[PDB]
């Protein structure tokens, strides 16, 4: 649905990073390059962005 | 009609009268607890509060009872209802104030269930007395039933959503008899097999084998923690196995402390060699096999699944014979607690690398498979020539199939030996196999070398298509892969044709197991109803309900089934 605020293992904030990660995906950086641009050296922090799927946009499309 | 009103299954005369739902019964998911004692069973606080035991007022304990009356339907320790001498029942919650009501001698107090109460703990289906074992109530905050690892082996319940039922006796006599006959430490042994039904859990058993390895050294601080955990510890530290470099205790020496009193037991090692006993140095035991326990101390060898297993002559069985059931229950708890503390420091692991083998071993496995396939081709061509002659009383086609199967079997055995040679003491998979707690040598052969022939109903896969098992195969194909033989290990991966044949083997196995359970249960139910009447009288003659004698003495020996143990006469076997 929406990115979790904190990484499941470290507790480092991932919610702010997700908007930056989407911008890196929009830019030349690939999914691996975007994680390198973030500079996370721990797989758990990289995994949260890589495995996350945004279903919030689908919910927004439906009329309220 | 009135005759129609009388009914059998789901009927008042039979279904309701013979079996009826019982109050004071609690059901919830079960989770294992190593720390909890074997008698103790974890109970959720909410279930414990709902369950109640009627208690006669006693002058010595009146102060506790009045406190329970003061807190009604609020605190966990409280009385939901009070029964007066008249027998009228009063609700504290409905009554405006609990304090105004006054307790009198002989009043009945519905105290909520508390730790130390005795309950009957049973699995949802009971096929034997061992399934139903009396347990001591213990309270834990979470809503789950917590039971010791040792009690799990008689229950035989895997912890995947499984649930169990506990019933609380409301009568002093019923509670006392349940303690005398159904207590879990008393039921550790089984009369039918004359052996304990309780065996060390696989995680503890593999750790025990690693703990009893010769190359185990423990620091003084680590040993002090193990002594603190041991209930059997007498508060006196044993002299260290190694003294001058630093105080050190061997794992076998720490296990000797766990063993209670002075029980003497000898158990053959799981990997113990018959050749070693015939050969010299049998007493020396170079392989550390031939486990021997003397004066309640492990002296030599490595403890194995057989030594701590649910079998006659086991070290736990010897503890039951001399130390007694209560001490044996403490011994089971002590082994688990010490093993867990040692296990976290030692560590346990499994990996693809343990499954993987050296390339030279893989090349050897490929060579034997190639030779077997060539031999099968030679048999097929000879059969077409008709050089092969049918064995008497057997079809030529059957003999040709049997000989091809023999070639596959010998090759699979050779690949299996290559898989065993690749395994090393460092390798985790070999260590689990050596303990025997989990895994098997045959499982290793499937994992590293050849899974083996896949068959349905013990016969090679038939040709569903005309003359062909599959469209990809040619007509009249006698190739081993066509007949479902699998020469590929699980780690290597399975070809789609092999995978389909493997699925057929899995499907047939699944059907037989499900059908078998229903049939065995049905026949057992008829047998249990038929033999329930038979019983032993005061004179010790076994008799039916009619009282016609079945046997003059029980078992033809007039002795308990558990008491008899295997012994060697050593008179008839030697020459005159």
């Amino acid at each position: 649905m929406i990115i979790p605020v904190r990484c499941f293992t470290c507790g480092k904030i991932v919610g702010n990073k997700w908007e930056a990660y989407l911008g890196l995906l929009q830019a030349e950086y690939t999914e691996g390059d975007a994680l390198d641009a973030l500079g996370l050296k721990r797989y758990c922090c990289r995994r949260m962005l890589l495995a996350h799927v945004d279903l919030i946009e689908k919910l927004l499309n439906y009329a309220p | 009609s009135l005759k129609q009103r009388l009914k059998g299954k789901e009927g008042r005369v039979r279904g309701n009268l013979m079996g009826k739902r019982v109050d004071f019964s609690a059901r919830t998911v079960i989770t294992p607890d190593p720390n909890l004692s074997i008698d103790q069973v974890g109970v959720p606080r909410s279930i414990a509060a709902n369950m109640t035991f009627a208690e006669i007022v006693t002058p010595f304990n009146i102060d506790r009872l009045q406190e329970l009356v003061r807190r009604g339907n609020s605190q966990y320790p409280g009385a939901k209802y009070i029964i007066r001498d008249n027998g009228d029942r009063i609700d504290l919650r409905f009554h405006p104030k609990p304090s105004d009501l006054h307790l009198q001698t002989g009043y009945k107090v519905e105290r909520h269930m508390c730790d130390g109460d005795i309950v009957i703990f049973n699995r949802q289906p009971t096929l034997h007395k061992m399934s139903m074992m009396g347990h001591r109530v213990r309270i834990l905050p979470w809503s789950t039933f917590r039971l010791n690892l040792s009690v799990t082996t008689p229950y035989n319940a895997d912890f995947d959503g499984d649930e169990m039922n506990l019933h609380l006796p409301q009568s002093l006599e019923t509670r006392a008899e349940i303690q005398e006959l159904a207590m879990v430490p008393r039921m550790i042994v089984t009369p039918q097999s004359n052996r304990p039904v309780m065996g060390i859990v696989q995680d503890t058993l593999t750790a025990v084998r690693k703990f009893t390895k010769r190359d185990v050294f423990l620091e003084r601080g680590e040993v002090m923690n193990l002594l603190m955990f041991l209930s059997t510890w007498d508060g006196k530290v044993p002299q260290p196995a190694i003294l001058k470099p630093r105080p050190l205790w061997t794992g076998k020496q720490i296990f000797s402390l766990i063993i209670p009193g002075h029980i003497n037991c000898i158990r053959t090692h799981s990997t113990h060699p018959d050749d070693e006993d015939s050969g010299p140095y049998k007493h020396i035991s170079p392989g550390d096999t031939k486990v021997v326990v003397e004066n309640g101390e492990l002296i030599m060898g490595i403890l194995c699944k057989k030594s701590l297993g649910t079998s006659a002559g086991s070290l736990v069985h010897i503890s039951y014979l001399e130390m007694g059931h209560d001490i044996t229950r403490l011994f089971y708890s002590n082994i688990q607690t010490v093993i867990n503390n040692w296990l976290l420091i030692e560590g346990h692991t499994i990996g693809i690398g343990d499954s993987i083998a050296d390339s030279k071993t893989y090349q050897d496995i490929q060579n034997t498979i190639k030779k077997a396939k060539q031999d099968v081709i030679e048999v097929i061509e000879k059969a077409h020539n008709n050089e092969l002659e049918p064995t008497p009383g057997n079809t030529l086609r059957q003999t040709f199939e049997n000989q091809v199967n023999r070639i596959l079997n010998d090759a699979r055995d050779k690949t299996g030996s290559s898989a065993q040679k690749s395994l090393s003491e460092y390798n985790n998979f070999k260590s689990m196999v050596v303990s025997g707690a989990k895994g098997s040598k045959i499982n290793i052969s499937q994992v590293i070398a050849v899974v083996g022939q896949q068959n349905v109903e013990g016969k090679r896969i038939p040709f569903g298509f005309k003359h062909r098992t599959l469209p990809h195969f040619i007509k009249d194909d006698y190739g081993p892969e066509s007949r479902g033989f699998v020469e590929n290990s699980y780690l290597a991966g399975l070809t789609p044709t092999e995978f389909f044949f493997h699925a057929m083997g899995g499907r047939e196995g699944l059907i037989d197991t499900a059908v078998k359970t229903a049939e065995t249960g049905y026949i057992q139910r008829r047998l249990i109803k038929s033999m329930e009447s038979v019983m032993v009288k005061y004179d010790a003659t076994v008799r039916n309900s009619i009282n016609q004698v079945v046997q003059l003495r029980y078992g033809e020996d007039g002795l308990a089934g558990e008491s008899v143990e295997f012994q060697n006469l050593a008179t008839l076997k030697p020459s005159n």
Partner: protein, 93 residues
Amino acid sequence: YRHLALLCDTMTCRGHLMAITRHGVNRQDTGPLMKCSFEETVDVLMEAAAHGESDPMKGVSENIMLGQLAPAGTGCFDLLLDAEKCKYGMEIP
């Protein structure tokens, strides 16, 4: 061996081969209440009333149906409290 020996001995106790089946239980010296618990209650009870037959109550099932303790272990013997042993006793408040 004791469990195996008992199963053959009870089967051969009659002196004829009998299968463990409902029909085999139906031909027995057991009382009508046991037959009533076996789903043949209507026929046996009419026959018992006509012949004035009386249930023995030997079976454990007959006792449990009436709510009496089954005649198993812990039920056959009856205790007999004795005053002479009671006389050397200490009263408690």
